[PDB]
């Protein structure tokens, strides 16, 4: 009016302190939030602003024959050939050629002055956004027109066969992309490196890691660089890797760099002082608790100053539950115990939850128990570190890593023979109920049935007698074990006197299985038919063959007994045998291959077989010792308490999961009902709501998708991770010579492959790759190798992060690598203790 009609349009040019979020459309990713540092007081962000995306359209997008070639790109390659690189030539080519209009670089030109003038040099940093995977970064640029000419350098970045390949690997449309261009001030620095808020090799929260290098560092410059790595806890520093540097990278005249040869004496001088390590962890926990999330910085050290140059989230991290109890605790993975450690949606948590009166908690889509009272007691500490030894041991070793930590933890009826039919004959019953009544059931009265049902389901699978019957047989193989041990010198005799035993709801699906086996061995047609089909509705189209017809029958037999069950079934939310049976054939195909015909007899016959005669060497063999006929006879009363009971410990869950799978049902009804009233757009988003956000909903006609969306956003980012064994309230992720780093765990055995360029490379599944040093133009080859060793070094390499996500054992900062190593030599390297051997 009165904004003279200037307020609607979009900016080119954005300086920090004047971004403001909700704009990252324009700004992206790493300006966003490099905005956001400027804002942060008591410490210092390099001057500088962000030509933005709308910089990027009035020069890009509607250029017809960018859109164009765009069209020849996007729409068919699938990065199949080297039409990615002809064409991606071509692309490039042209948006360098392709000229900044001359109104924007005139606001440029102002900028640039108050910030300021040009004889100071430049870092462009590209900034993404989708309307990370990789994107340059340009230092130590010179004027306007190197400047002018790195922009487009820049855009041009989104187009290498890298990139675009990242985009066509995922759904990224290439026209949905757009960079945003940071434009920075040059703080020639003689100390840099990089800092994670959490214990990159840990997670731990209270350690914060640095690594620093003279000059540029290895995040800064790419090269062969060597850096100290310093860890910080509780504002004392708690461990120093100190690097002989012989080598660093600084900046130059003009815009490129050399590689100094540092004298003696300065390579085993610290590259920080104590008081400048403290000085920083400092300013990296300011910063940590201003974003509210665990950061990773990129810092530089100038006259004595620390200029923070870039700040982001630190991605992959196990989320730690929100308990509300105080003090150091410990947590305990039911995903393993449970063997699954798949993450569950949360209408899956909720009813695992809801028929539980244990108090779990949840973190990064999965369940975890409280420990840590158990653990405060000799006596209570001790039964729970003894029984993780059975059941799930490597727990028990992650639990004993925990016990003395030291700066961690404070210091301190067997019921009737008729039992066990009377429960299986109940639930079946109840079952059968069950059935019945939820077809009736509909609407706001279905969810008021199952909360009732809940209340049968807890009644009729967890009685006390079931308890009890389930701890008779588990009590008594404990007993077997330890005391025959104790007296004859044999462990673990509970496995083989348990063999085969009768009434195992599991081992007789099992077994049951391999009959549907043999049954499909001798029709070649329908066997040959089932590895080649990709065919959900398959079962209608068998009876066409000379095998099928027979197969659909047993298939169905099978499906009816058995059809609830799943690898995931503790998730409601996941996919049953009966829902899609194509999920059942792998099992199958594995059962034809490899097991004879008829070994559902077989293997279950030379079981007992097995068993029996088990149980008379030991007895006979007890006779034979002191008080040996008395307690020969306790054994037999303990081994025929083991058999009855042994197999009833599997029969409860099947019987919960039984009605898991009849609520599913129901509830994907309602699902359904609530899309054709038009709530929800497909009926299967009633995963992503917790049972009562899900009851509320079907009574109000009401839904948040935003809640619903982030929910599956965040399952997303959670599938990506991987539970410990036991986490702690500090984050701290508790699993189970040629000397060097040791940056991601774990150990393997293969063929050195010694690479200098990306180009030349061949990657076989076998081969550790070896090289001087390692980019995110190096990313592209994680896939393929076993292990990484470098000879750059620090905690938070580049290959060492990239390492470290993949799951891949990686060795940095050997000293000369390349040379030392030969390639084509088998090697093991161990990336949990720093070493690589060469061996034969």
């Not at 040059?186 to 997670?203: K, R, V």
């Not at 004496?265 to 002082?273: A, C, P, R, V, Y």
């Not at 009265?445 to 967890?462: G, N, T």
């Amino acid at each position: 009016h009165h904004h003279h009609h200037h307020g609607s349009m979009k900016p080119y040019v954005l300086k920090f302190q004047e971004i403001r979020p909700h704009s990252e459309a324009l700004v992206g990713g790493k300006g966003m939030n490099l905005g956001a540092c400027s804002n942060i007081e008591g410490v210092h962000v390099p001057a500088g602003f962000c030509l933005t995306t709308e910089a990027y359209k009035r020069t890009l997008a509607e250029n017809n024959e960018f859109t164009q070639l765009l069209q020849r790109l996007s729409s068919l390659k699938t990065s199949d050939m080297d039409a990615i690189r002809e064409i991606s030539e071509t692309i490039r080519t042209l948006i360098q050629h392709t000229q900044i209009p001359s109104e924007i670089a005139s606001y440029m030109d102002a900028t640039l002055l108050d910030v300021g003038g040009y004889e100071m040099p430049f870092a462009v940093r590209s900034s993404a956004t989708a309307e990370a995977g990789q994107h340059d970064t340009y230092l130590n640029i010179i004027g306007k027109d190197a400047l002018l000419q790195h922009i487009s350098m820049c855009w041009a970045s989104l187009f290498t066969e890298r990139a675009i390949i990242y985009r066509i690997q995922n759904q990224f449309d290439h026209r949905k992309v757009q960079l945003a261009v940071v434009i920075q001030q040059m703080i020639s620095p003689e100390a840099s490196g990089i800092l994670f808020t959490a214990d990159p090799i840990t997670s731990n929260r209270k350690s914060l890691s640095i690594d620093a290098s003279f000059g540029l560092g290895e995040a800064l410059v790419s090269g062969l660089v060597s850096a100290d790595s310093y860890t910080v806890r509780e504002n004392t520093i708690t461990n120093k890797i100190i690097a002989t540097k012989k080598l660093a990278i600084y900046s130059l005249k003009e815009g490129g760099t050399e590689t100094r040869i540092l004298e003696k004496s300065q390579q085993t001088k610290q590259t920080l002082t104590d008081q400048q390590i403290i000085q920083l962890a400092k300013l990296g926990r300011k910063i940590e608790a201003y974003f509210g999330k665990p950061q990773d910085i990129e810092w530089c050290l100038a006259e004595g100053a620390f200029y923070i140059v870039q700040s982001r989230p630190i991605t992959t991290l196990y989320p730690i539950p929100e308990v509300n109890e105080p003090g150091n605790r410990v947590y305990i993975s039911v995903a393993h115990q449970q063997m699954m450690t798949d993450a569950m949606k949360p209408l899956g948590l909720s009813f695992y939850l809801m028929t539980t009166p244990a108090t779990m908690y949840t973190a990064g889509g999965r369940l975890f128990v409280d420990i840590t009272q158990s653990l405060s007691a000799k006596v209570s500490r001790d039964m729970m570190v003894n029984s993780l030894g059975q059941s799930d041991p490597l727990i028990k070793d992650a639990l004993l890593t925990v016990i003395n930590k030291k700066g961690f933890l404070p210091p301190l009826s067997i019921p009737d023979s008729s039992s066990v039919f009377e429960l299986v004959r109940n639930s079946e019953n109840s079952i059968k109920h069950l059935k019945q009544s939820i077809e009736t059931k509909s609407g706001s009265d279905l969810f008021d049935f199952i909360v009732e049902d809940l209340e049968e389901l807890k009644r009729v699978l967890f009685n006390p007698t079931s308890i009890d019957a389930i701890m008779a047989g588990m009590d008594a193989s404990a007993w077997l074990n330890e005391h025959i041990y104790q007296w004859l010198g044999e462990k673990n005799v509970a496995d083989k006197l348990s063999e085969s035993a009768p009434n195992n709801i599991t081992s007789q699906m099992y077994l049951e299985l391999l009959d549907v086996a043999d049954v499909i061995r001798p029709y070649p047609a329908v066997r040959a038919y089932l590895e080649q089909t990709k065919n959900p509705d398959f079962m209608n189209e068998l009876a066409t063959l000379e095998g099928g017809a027979e197969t659909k029958k047993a298939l169905e037999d099978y499906l009816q007994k058995y059809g609830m069950r799943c690898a995931g079934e503790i998730d409601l939310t996941k996919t049953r045998w009966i829902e899609n049976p194509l999920t059942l054939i792998p099992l199958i195909l594995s059962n034809i291959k490899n097991f004879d015909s008829s070994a559902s007899m077989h293997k279950f016959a030379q079981g007992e077989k097995e068993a029996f005669h088990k149980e008379q060497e030991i007895l006979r063999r007890l006779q034979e010792l002191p008080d040996g006929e008395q307690k020969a006879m306790e054994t037999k009363e303990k081994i025929d308490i083991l058999r009855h009971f042994i197999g009833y410990r599997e029969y409860p869950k099947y019987g919960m999961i039984n009605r898991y799978f009849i609520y599913k049902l129901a509830l994907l009804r309602a699902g359904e009902q609530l899309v054709k009233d038009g709530i929800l757009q497909e009926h299967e988003d009633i995963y992503f709501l917790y049972f009562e956000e899900l009851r509320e909903v079907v009574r109000t006609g009401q839904v948040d998708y935003e809640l619903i969306n982030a929910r599956k956003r965040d399952f997303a980012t959670f599938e990506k991770l991987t539970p410990p064994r036991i986490l702690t309230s500090d984050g701290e992720m508790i699993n189970g010579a040629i000397l060097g780093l040791p940056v991601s765990s774990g150990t393997v055995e293969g063929r050195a492959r010694v690479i200098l360029e990306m180009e030349k490379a061949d990657l076989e599944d076998g081969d550790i790759l070896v090289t001087a040093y390692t980019d995110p133009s190096w990313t592209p080859a994680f896939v393929s190798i076993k292990g990484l060793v470098t000879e750059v070094g620090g905690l938070m390499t580049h290959g060492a992060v990239i390492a470290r996500e993949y799951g891949l054992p990686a060795v940095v900062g050997v000293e000369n690598a390349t040379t030392i190593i030969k390639d084509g030599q088998q090697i093991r390297i161990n990336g949990t203790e720093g070493y690589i051997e060469i061996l034969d």
